[PDB]
Design a protein around this ligand. Structure first.
Ligand SMILES: [Zn+2]
Ligand SMILES: [Zn+2]
Length: 105
DNA sequence: TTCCTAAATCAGAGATAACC
DNA sequence: AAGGTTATCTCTGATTTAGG
């Protein structure tokens, strides 16, 4: 078990939010008292596995992504290319390909 | 000093489940 | 096998404790 807000793996008392997640005591109390997520000393780590053996994006050729998706032909595509196609019904152009992947909140 | 926020601890409501 | 009692667990909310 780990806290959804801060990633802590131990706490004096586990609490939960209204949607199936666990919160450490500190984070749970903060949210209830203020209505906002408990601010972190340092950002909560995440990122995870960005590569997969034997896989690259059929549309932009990248080998790293936050989530491997599939195109209509059944080939793996990276998260950016799969989402761009869903929104625009055209493939994401190579001109949009960037050097790295950003992280958020 | 007193005020206030943060977060551990305490009380007990409701969930789980041992055992008859 | 199923159902009732109620020990015990696991939370939510109240209170206490500690610092700034
Ligand atoms: Zn937390
Ligand atoms: Zn791609």
């Amino acid at each position: 078990r780990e806290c959804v807000n801060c990633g802590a793996t131990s706490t004096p008392l586990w609490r939960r939010d209204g949607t199936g997640h666990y919160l450490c005591n500190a984070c749970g109390l903060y949210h209830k008292m203020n209505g906002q997520n408990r601010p972190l000393i340092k950002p909560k780590r995440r990122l995870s596995a960005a590569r997969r053996a034997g896989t690259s994006c059929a549309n932009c050729q990248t080998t790293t992504t936050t989530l491997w998706r599939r195109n209509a032909n059944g080939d793996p595509v990276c998260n950016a290319c799969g989402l761009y196609y869903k929104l625009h019904n055209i493939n994401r152009p190579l001109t949009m390909k960037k050097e790295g992947i950003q992280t958020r909140n």
